[PDB]
Structures are given as C-alpha cells and as structure tokens.
Structure 1
Amino acid sequence: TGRPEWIWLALGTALMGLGTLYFLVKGMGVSDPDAKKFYAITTLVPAIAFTMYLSMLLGYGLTMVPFGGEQNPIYWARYADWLFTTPLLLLDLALLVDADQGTILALVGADGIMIGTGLVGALTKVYSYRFVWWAISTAAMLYILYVLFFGFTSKAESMRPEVASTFKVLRNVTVVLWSAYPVVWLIGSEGAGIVPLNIETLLFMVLDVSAKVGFGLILLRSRAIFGEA
C-alpha cells in the first residue's frame, strides 16, 4: 500500500479501535439504565468509525470519480461512517437535555439530508453541481447547529447543573468541530482541490478522532449521564 494517505488511515484505524476498546471496558460495570444508554451510543460511534477507517485503509472504501477531466480518488466510506455516527452523536446530545421526540426527529432527518447530499456531491461527475450539493448539505448543517444553540441550550439550562454544563461544553465542541468538515471538503479533493488528498485525510482524521473519541471522553467521564442517586 503506497497511497501516501495510508499513514493517516492506519492511525485513524488504530485510534478508533483503541477508543472503542476503552469505552467498552469502561462501560463494563455500569448498571444505571440512563448511563447504559450513553455508553451504548457513545461506544458504537468509534466502533463504526473503526470499521470504516479499516475499509479505507484496505482500499475497499475508495472509488474513482471522473470530474474536472481527471480520475479523482473519493473515499466513499466516510459517508457510510457519518451516516450512522453523526445521528448517534446528536442522540447523545438530545438525550442529555431530554429533547422532545419531534426535535430529535428533525435533527436526525436534517442530519441524514446533510450526509446524503454530501455523498451525492462527492460522487457527482459534473464539477459545478458538486458545489450545489455542498451548499444544500451545509444548509442542513446550519439547521442542526441552529437547533443545538437556540433550542437545546434553552431546555438544558432548565436541567440539572451537571447536565447544563456538560451539554454546553459538548455543544461547543460539536459546533466547532462539525463546522470544519464542510470547509475541508470544499478546499480538498472532493471540492476545489487546493489541499491534496493526503493532507485532507490527515485533517479528517484529526476531526474524526476529536469529534468521536474526544467527545466521548468528555461525555463518559461526566456525572450528567447518571440519574441523580
């Protein structure tokens, strides 16, 4: 394997795998029903990302897409990852603040549109249309961030202090990290092609590990995931 980005795919694979194992072992010896929900959701996230990084590392999760008169390597497995992991991450946030079902459905639905349209944009062969899908996806992302900041922050402040403050930290982490993804896509090989694939891959790896394992480390060490005992 001589793809230059292989090193970042290997490191992502390793870090997701180690993250999954840590959460799995940490979650052993938890009986609180509420805490079990968070452990289950949060452990699945890097477990799924592990499998999809491994598929990229082994070359399964890569296809060639012709656009701009070239054969462009597109790691389609990222979207398969994000389709399942990003709603789980939003579920962690929503459960934390005890969001109502309708809000959860809107968030997960907007998230599916965001990832779905990003995959279409990534596979689209007419260059200028790629950015049409990027814009729709980014609009869906803005909707999600809107809800997290101006709906979830409303109900969280009415929750327990440990819930309010854990939510606020995870909210901020999410807004910052999630916002970088459309930027990397736009400047990387899926978009304008300014940043080469190997650096794009490093950037997504840093984002993915932070948004998944970092997020989970903050969440799962907090007392907000337990019922008041």
Structure 2
Amino acid sequence: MVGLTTLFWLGAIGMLVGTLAFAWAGRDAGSGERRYYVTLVGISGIAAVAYAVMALGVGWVPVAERTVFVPRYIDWILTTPLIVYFLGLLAGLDSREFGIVITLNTVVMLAGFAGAMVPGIERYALFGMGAVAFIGLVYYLVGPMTESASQRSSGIKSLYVRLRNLTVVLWAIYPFIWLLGPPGVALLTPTVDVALIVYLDLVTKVGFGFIALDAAATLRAEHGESLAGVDTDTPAVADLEHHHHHH
C-alpha cells in the first residue's frame, strides 16, 4: 500500500539514530571494544537498508491473497544471528557452541520465512517447530551463557543481565505477532501488527545498543580511557641506597 510504507520509513529513522550513536561513540572508544561497536553498528546498519528498501515497495512478493516481504524475513536471517552473536561476544562461548546458537537461528528464521509462504494453513506446522526451537534459543540466553558471562569480567555481568533479560523479553513477543498478526491468523490490523514487528527489530538493536553505550561508557570511565604505552627515555631516579661508605 501507500500508507503501509510509512512503517518501514519510521523504523529506518530509528536505525539511523542508532547507527550514528554507535559509530561516533565507537570511534572514540579504545582498542578492543571496537569489536562490540562495529558489531552493534552492523545490525543497526543492515536493518537500516532493509527498511529503506521495503519502504519503497521493493522485495514485496505476492501470495494468493496475502503479501509476504522477502527483505523483511531475510533481514531477520542476517540480524537475528547477529544479535545472539553479540551475546556470544559478551560471555565468550566456544567454537562449537557459537555454531550451535547461529545454526539454531538459521532453522528458526527459515521456519517463519516459509511460514508466510504457505498456500493454505500448513504454516501452523512450520511455526510449530519455530516455537519449540525458539524456546531452545531463549534457553541458551539464560543457560550456560549465565556462568560464562558472569565469569568473564566484572562489567560483563552488567551488560549480560541487561541485554539478555531485555532481548529475550521483547523477542518472546515475536511468536505472538507472527501467529496473531497477518503472518498467522491476522487478529489486528495489517498496519498495526507491522508497526509492532518493525518495533521489535528496532527495539532489540537500538534498545540494547543504547544500554550498550552507557555500560561501555562506564567501563572506560572507571579509569578514563584504556591505558597504553608511554615514550620516556632515562627515567627519574629517587631511591638507590649506597653500599659503599668506608673503604
């Protein structure tokens, strides 16, 4: 529609805000945190373009009587695994462990994708696994990641609790918006439901990303910027104690 595009436009605005908030504050950061910054910027960025394109009407595919958005579902495939990846950076999982969280997000996002691409009502089955699988992911959020992060660093505990709790909550809302919204049985208005959806992606990235800045700001503020080497030739002596007095 013509008024539906407004949604993607709005979401795109929130993305621009985050992108800059993390880009500017990120460049001012020290050496090491850049990983968490570039990552956070990556999600807000990929999303920003997805909203801008969908906002123009491109990527829209027709389906019998309903319309599915490819760039939307695909955007999630690129963002969702990126979010869980962020959580993995905080705690610090293993090589195989990282593959488990990402592989799960792949099959999950794949369930929903084909979910809306159903010619009848088979979607109930696709999402069926999407829900069970979903719980699997949320489990990891409050699973081993708890002991891994709580034992990684002092600041990690703060960023882990705020991010994990916040993310899982709003994320746990997805099963409702997809099932109830148009992608499922369409309870509310196509425009209203979408508003919540875009809001869900916009809240995850920007939401923790904002809290992300505050926390990281305290990490560097506890010592005023990360320490580094200094250039100084021939130090200043003050104590040496002589051993020769009588000879």
The match for 1:99 is: 93
Structure 2 unpaired stretches of 5+:
228-247
The match for 1:133 is: 126
SS of 1:48's equivalent in the other structure is helix
Query: Which residue identity lines up with residue 47 of structure 1 in the other structure?
Result: G
Q: Which protein, 1 or 2, shows the higher relative CO under an 8 Å CA cutoff with sep ≥ 6?
A: 1
SS of 2:184's equivalent in the other structure is coil
Going from structure 1 to structure 2, the CA distance change for 1:228 and 1:161 (only over 3 Å counts) comes to farther
Instruction: For 2:62 and 2:210, locate their aligned partners in 1 and report how far apart those are by CA, in whole Å.
Output: 36
Are the aligned partners of 1:122 and 1:130 in contact in 2 as well (CA < 8 Å)? Answer: yes
Residue by residue, what CA displacement relative to the aligned partner does 1:88-134 show, whole Å, maximum 9, x if unpaired?
1111111101112221110000001111111011112122x111111
The match for 1:115 is: 109
Query: Which residue identity lines up with residue 215 of structure 2 in the other structure?
Result: S
Percent identity between matched residues is: 28
**Of Structure 1 and Structure 2, which has the larger fraction of its residues in helix?**
1
Please identify runs of 4+ aligned residues in structure 1 that moved more than 4 A. Answer: 224-229
Larger Rg over CA atoms: 2
- Number of aligned residues: 222
SS of 2:28's equivalent in the other structure is coil
The match for 2:241 is: none
The match for 1:24 is: 23
Query: Which residue identity lines up with residue 155 of structure 1 in the other structure?
Result: S
Q: How much has 1:161 moved relative to structure 2?
A: 2.5
Structure 1 unpaired stretches of 5+:
none
Query: Does the alignment pair 1:53 with 2:51?
Result: yes
Q: 2:154 aligns with which of 152, 161, 183?
A: 161
SS of 1:64's equivalent in the other structure is strand
Query: Which residue identity lines up with residue 49 of structure 1 in the other structure?
Result: A
TM-score, scaled to structure 2? 0.84
Cα RMSD after superposing both structures = 1.8
Residue by residue, what CA displacement relative to the aligned partner does 1:49-96 show, whole Å, maximum 9, x if unpaired?
111111111001321112xxxx10222221111111111111111110
